[PDB]
Amino acid sequence: SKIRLGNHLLHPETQMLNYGYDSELSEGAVKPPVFLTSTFVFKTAEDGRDFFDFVSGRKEPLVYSRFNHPNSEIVEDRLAVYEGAESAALFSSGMSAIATTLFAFVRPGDVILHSQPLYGGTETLLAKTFFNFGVEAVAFADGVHEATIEKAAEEALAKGRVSVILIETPANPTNSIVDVAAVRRVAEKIEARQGSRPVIACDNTLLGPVFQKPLDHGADLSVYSLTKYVGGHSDLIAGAVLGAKSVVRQVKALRGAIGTQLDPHSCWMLGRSLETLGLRMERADSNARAIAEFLRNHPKVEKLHYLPFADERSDIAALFKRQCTGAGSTFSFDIKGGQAAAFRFLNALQILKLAVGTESLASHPAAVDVRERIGVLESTIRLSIGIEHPDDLIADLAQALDA
Amino acid sequence: LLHPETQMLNSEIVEDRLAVYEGAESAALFSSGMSAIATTLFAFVRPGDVILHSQPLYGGTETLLAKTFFNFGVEAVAFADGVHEATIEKAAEEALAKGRVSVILIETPANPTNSIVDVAAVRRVAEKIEARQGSRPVIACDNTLLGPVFQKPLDHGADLSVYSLTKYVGGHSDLIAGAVLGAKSVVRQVKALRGAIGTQLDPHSCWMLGRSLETLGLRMERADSNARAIAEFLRNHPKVEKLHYLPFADERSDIAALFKRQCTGAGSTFSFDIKGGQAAAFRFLNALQILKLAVSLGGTESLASHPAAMTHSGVPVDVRERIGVLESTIRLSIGIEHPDDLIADLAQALDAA
Amino acid sequence: SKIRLGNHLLHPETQMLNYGYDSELSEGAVKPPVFLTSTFVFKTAEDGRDFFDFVSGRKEPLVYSRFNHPNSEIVEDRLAVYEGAESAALFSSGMSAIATTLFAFVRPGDVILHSQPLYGGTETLLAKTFFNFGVEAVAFADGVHEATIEKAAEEALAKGRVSVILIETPANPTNSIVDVAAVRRVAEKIEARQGSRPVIACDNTLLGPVFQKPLDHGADLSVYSLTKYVGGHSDLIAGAVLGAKSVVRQVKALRGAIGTQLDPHSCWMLGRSLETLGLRMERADSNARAIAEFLRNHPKVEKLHYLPFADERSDIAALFKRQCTGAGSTFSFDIKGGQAAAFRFLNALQILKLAVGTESLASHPAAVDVRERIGVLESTIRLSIGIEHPDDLIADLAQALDA
Amino acid sequence: LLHPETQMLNSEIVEDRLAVYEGAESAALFSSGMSAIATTLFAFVRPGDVILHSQPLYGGTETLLAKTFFNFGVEAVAFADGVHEATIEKAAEEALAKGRVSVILIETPANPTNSIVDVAAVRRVAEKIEARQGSRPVIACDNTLLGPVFQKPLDHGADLSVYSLTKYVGGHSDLIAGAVLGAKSVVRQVKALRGAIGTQLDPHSCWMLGRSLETLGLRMERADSNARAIAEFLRNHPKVEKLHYLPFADERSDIAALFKRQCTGAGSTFSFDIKGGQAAAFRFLNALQILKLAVSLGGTESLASHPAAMTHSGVPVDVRERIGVLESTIRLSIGIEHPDDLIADLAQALDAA
């Protein structure tokens, strides 16, 4: 399967259609009366001409059909293409990808060094299930600064062997971020004190694969819930892990032991979603930007947690600028008027829906010091922006802002 | 005023969404484009009728008229020039002479060279027919090529907007479907006949179409812009003789003026003529590595074919040459790949030609 | 694709798995770490041994996958195998199969000679849509006797050219039947008076393909709603037409003109249903027999319309005995006590469901001379028996019989 | 008393149906057999524990124990003879000596030669363990081979009945699933861990399994009777040395007596030894035209394989020979084809051997 056409290098959007294409064709007999069906493809122009000599009825009578049933291995290769990674493994869910990854690298006595906050399933996974297997966890709250990461890392090194550094960036809600390259420098030091480099696993669900590539900034694994945004549908549940071949091979071996792979039908559906990923992501992201501009300078908005509007001089702005190529579709704002106004705003929405991709959503993460440190107040509204028309989203936001 | 892309996020439910995208009052779904066409015709025609129609039509539609309807005592009269009211008028008079004109069946733009017909003109010709025979024919417009994003024929005089959704809306080779859109009462008549002859779209396909509609705006826009980029590249290529692409019609021609008033975009499908005849065409085709050799795969992947030796090989030469289908003509149907990959493929294949 | 293994001839149940099997395999690369997946098949034992040399990890590294995506042509060939027909065409529905069939053979001026009663969609198709294209219809009420068929046929020959004889046997409800061979003799005479033999199309939905094969008794086409019983699921809608190759080819040509073919996904689902057809049909039929024995001699049952219990000496019994190999799963009985008792019985059922395959169903066809001639009284209950345990069905029937 | 076949006509809904078929109080669905197994183990074991288990286990389960659980500080002790309480007892004592015995993991009958284990015996050994250590291990029985139709291990002392539904219940190569069945409170613990590690069965597969359950009784019965017919044919065939098929155990053996009390049928999978060693085995395999060469395709199609050179090639020879896996051993997994076609295929392939 080609990554080049002569000297020209193929882009990902092309590759979601072409990479492994030959392996998606089936053959059937040509039987009269001959009609062109929705699936027929021809190896050569002369083959097409011969087929239509039957269709025309000029001649009395093999034909290829292109269907969309890629193996898991081919959908993995396409993911890896999008990421710019060597290799990929698919999983039945985001949580099974994370769990299998942790099971492949940790042992009782170990410490998982991680960022904060993390997806709630990941926190409960570390706090209960891994704690019960003798695995400890130490958090760094501030992932922007190499110094705060270094500190937590000493705290971890004193509880035991650091076998994994687990980060999520940006994290939900409010998009605090971690400096992946700083995490990698700190892993090189950890390794000096202990004789092994921990595996750096980055939950890239929020911005990946289009707007952030953690493997290009020092991560060893880029991990996903493909359920959330890539898949584009609530009935498509999947996770993935991507990185270098030998590291991914170790997760695959664990994946086969514990049986966490993605089933073939879901692989087919994912192959179909990938076809429109670049379109869906780019629209979501442009929609989020237009909405962000509208909320900024809106009388009823206290604060916007939107990374492109961080101050030029801040460390956050500098990091975002070197680690990311876009802001994705998820962000938060604090409304003027606390809870009762936030609820009234929510209750008024007619286009954005209330829940917890594709469709635009609004939620209230609060529903005390922990929540405020994150920037989750009772005035806080989290928006996850889909692919509706931006004008229509903005209209709905204006009127709900009960204004 | 909500945009349709916003509103996309049962047969009955999907029909309602399609009606919203079209801006129509109601919609009926069918197992295929051809079944939508047939069911529509059988709802409206009876032995002794005449179907007046534009030219060229899709080949399945031609067969349907020439064979099946002809056997049921329904004749057909073509107009080759649907741009001018006067040529549409001449045809209608031939048709009135042969029987009751119950349907006017048009297809615009037409595959594979984007011939067009003036839907408002056809409507006026229909209102003359009504004056001269007592009843106004149903105007059905096969809007597959640009619809529903880039043309709304119900806004320009059609009574029904008819689709193969297989081609572009659905997105994939395994999703086949047809639709008929218009006023509840004209549509209701099509559904009754649907119920009788069992031409409904199956539920799973209705579900799959539902899903497809969510990305329809994005995919159509992208295919359209990929197509414009490719047409622009080809227009300057020294192995390309002629383009059949409506945005490139001279701003002063009647075609240009009609395109500007009836359409908001060119869609994904067009043709060009290569230098060096059929043998050059065939070498170009055989060197393609990204565009596949095919007629349709649902609209997501880009395809190339040779209409004179393939789809239009059974069409008489007078029709072919009138619409610009020559031995050097290549049809392209552009999907949503990166435009640079498509252009690089085209450029290397043109070097083989 | 094989119909024989050496000299041994393959049975249909085998063929639903094997016929076109090679065309259902896909190929993928063998990539480490190697695991056996749910889909792998091996061309040879040495190939299997080599694959597991990877799986065992003895060696570091092509493999075939068997999925179930048959072309429509292959599912058609499998149907034809079950029928003992040369050829088959698939359609989007039972009604599209019937309509396409009629459209392929009739023209304004023609008469459709048919049996009675017919499925309601077929009656409305003949009474409205074909009447409006100048096509007339003449019925024979008694399809057992060559004489009553002959009479209607004269009545038809006097209205115009008889191009189709359309029969449904057994018909719903009450399982009146038509003598297909008698219909064929009458078609040979029609042909003598007019110079063409009409096409004999037999709606075989009730007993086909296992318990009746109309093509073996003089029919030219065996036509189906595969929705009702073959498919085994309400979301699987399909029809078919089967017979000799040249006759089926004419229906296919019409099918391509009017676009009434069955879509690929439904073809796949049908391919899956066929795998269990022989099992489902044989259970349904044995269940119906056990239930029939129970209702017969049940105090509260007036009359049973069950073909195996027709009197030995009757023409009906003789016909059934030479035309059918079983009774299928659908029949009727008249309860003692008219409407109010029939309703009470229905309302009491807990296992059989009230509606209009796979699951057992009960309905009231009445809900006056037309209905009685058929043997649809207000006491009449129609049962369509599914694949539940016979003991459980009988239990539910006993108690509902409000007894 | 309703039969389960009657009651088959959300994850939650399908779980309830499976629980009815098993006769269990509750069920949890998983993405695979292996994920059902893993999730169960991780719900119950902690570092310092010992998993006592029967032998042979499925190869994925062996790996899971030998690698993953061993790395998490959980050791494992096997008993080779699960027919006799005394050998199960000896093993349990070895296990108590190494740590807390938290699970007893059994698999009966075992693939590919139908070794069996006495589930009531294991339960008594568990109650002795409880007396000697303070807590009674969870008994999990991998019932894939006969369940749920032909064995109910929860009726004979197991705490949990664990399945690869991929193998026989689901019916097809594209339906992979696992299950854990038992009391609501033991199951509830497995679901909590399921929620945490994300091992749930996807909705579409839950839907597909739903459908499969409707024909489960018919397909299992048919496979079982096809298998009995084939075993009967093979038993008299002059190129067949030995059968590994539980109905053919001597009515006086302990195996026979245990089979009669714990099982209601033999299911579809068994083995036989061919005369002429591996080279004859391989020629037999390569001549098959109806049975395919494979390990599993979901249970509908009949398959043949060579365990010593394929699935059990990594298993040490002492285990292999104890369970009767020899170079001459052929595994058959019988589907729902007509028995005459299968026997005709077997007979012609045996002539090549």
Ligand SMILES: *Cc1c(COP(=O)(O)O)cnc(C)c1O
């Ligand atoms: C949802 C989510 C997960 C877990 O994904 P599932 O597919 O639902 O198991 C992990 N990480 C992040 C950031 C998430 O949003």
Ligand SMILES: *Cc1c(COP(=O)(O)O)cnc(C)c1O
């Ligand atoms: C393909 C096509 C049809 C027929 O649609 P099907 O879905 O293939 O039956 C009708 N009209 C036009 C213009 C087409 O391109």
Ligand SMILES: *Cc1c(COP(=O)(O)O)cnc(C)c1O
């Ligand atoms: C239902 C039925 C039909 C029509 O079938 P559809 O698949 O529902 O279009 C035709 N004949 C008979 C006997 C029927 O029961």
Ligand SMILES: *Cc1c(COP(=O)(O)O)cnc(C)c1O
């Ligand atoms: C296949 C199998 C497993 C594993 O099931 P998967 O669904 O393939 O993960 C477990 N136990 C037994 C006995 C098996 O045969």
